[PDB]
Amino acid sequence: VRYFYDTEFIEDGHTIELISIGVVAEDGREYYAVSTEFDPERAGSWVRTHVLPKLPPPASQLWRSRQQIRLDLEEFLRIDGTDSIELWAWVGAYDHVALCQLWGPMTALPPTVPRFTRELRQLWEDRGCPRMPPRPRDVHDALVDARDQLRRFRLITS
Template sequence: MEERGYRYFYDCEFIEDGVTIDLVSIGVVDEEGREFYAVSTEFDDRKAIPWVRRNVLDKLPSPSDKAWRSRERIRDDLYEFLVAPLRGRAQTRMELWAWYAAYDHVALAQLWGAMPALPRALPRMTKDLKQLWDDLGRPDLPVIEGDQHDALADARHNLARWRVMRDGDTPPAV
């Protein structure tokens, strides 16, 4: 029997200084529409370049919002979100998908520390939607309106992109 993939589409916002990728926020949407969103209470906003301040930090929810969590709590809550739908499902593996996936995967994996600490249930790589789009001849994709660089809005957009690429449909507005 062929193992079926259960897909998650995600996006991370982060501060990157050439040495460190510091998670700011993560948004995840699964193929059934469940959503996860968290903002780290531990990133160093002093290291953010003006573009990140303007396009990411200035758009974060109020610090009193329940999305704000420690990295440890993000890690634990995210793990539960990712593995819960797979419990009791035979022949199901997890697939992670992101646009320009390499940075996102590093930001996600760092929640567990060094790569060997990543739980066995989680994939060791994230599939790249941008690469798939290139491989398919760059079909028209939905255009995101308004909330670009909001991790959850971008995760929703990644799911919409994947659906268009999978089905070959006309892109919907996102």
Template sequence: MRCTLGRKVYTVVVYRYFYDCEFIEDGVTIDLVSIGVVDENGREFYAVSTEFDGSKAIPWVRHNVLDKLPSPADSAWQPRKKIRDELYEFLVAPLRGRTGERIELWAWYGAYDHIALAQLWGAMPALPRALPRMTKDLKQRWDDLGNPDLPKPPPDQHSALADARHNLARWQAMEQTAR
């Protein structure tokens, strides 16, 4: 992306991250269960919260999400504070020491995902400045492009990491259509 400021032209490098959150939503609270993130270079992040209240999950979430989580002995299970700190490091590491670069977050129906991600920091104003204040929506992009063919969902759909990978594959298919 090229930006102009006065007579100077700057190149802005965009780091795109594709992610998915699994969560329990009860009409009042969005409670993070897991988060998966992939970038365009193949780096991946996956974590499962040790702090969600599974008793509030509706049957669909119990069957399609909770029943498919890794064993509680798996290292993916972490307290929210550790997820927050490691996720932040994962997202900002490629930008360290560089200027003119920014992060874009992309998800399918991204509003809920963004809330689940942002709540790792507490209230929305506590979200670090290096992170976007919104998640771009892949579903809207797909609609804007006229609903082109997309890759089929993976067999392990509703795993946050599998869905994040699928979001990257959707993006790549849409970019081919947009050219």
């Protein structure tokens, strides 16, 4: 049913070039990958500072082509499976576009992937902004961030 995701990327007002994506399922399963296809030379100061140094070493099998990440997510999200799929992120408009663009134009998204991502900050506000734990030390690592979103959701819906 529910997946919580977050991405890092280099975005210049025109494209969103995926660096990494973390996805964590309410059931416990976790997926993380880093694209071998973004150009680190195109990163701005902020991304160079906060994002790139947290990436796995270059030898890690966590580094994957975009075709591999798409295929990995079709499996991970169980797109062919029995359960309905619900995607969640925090303040995730660009995250949703980054995800969908692994498949192409919005058209190309598998029939069972939702055409919207539920906005965890909206749920949080709707429930009176209950106290959340402080942000993890390793923010801007997309798996750490994705994990933190499931944590928040569990707390909010507790």
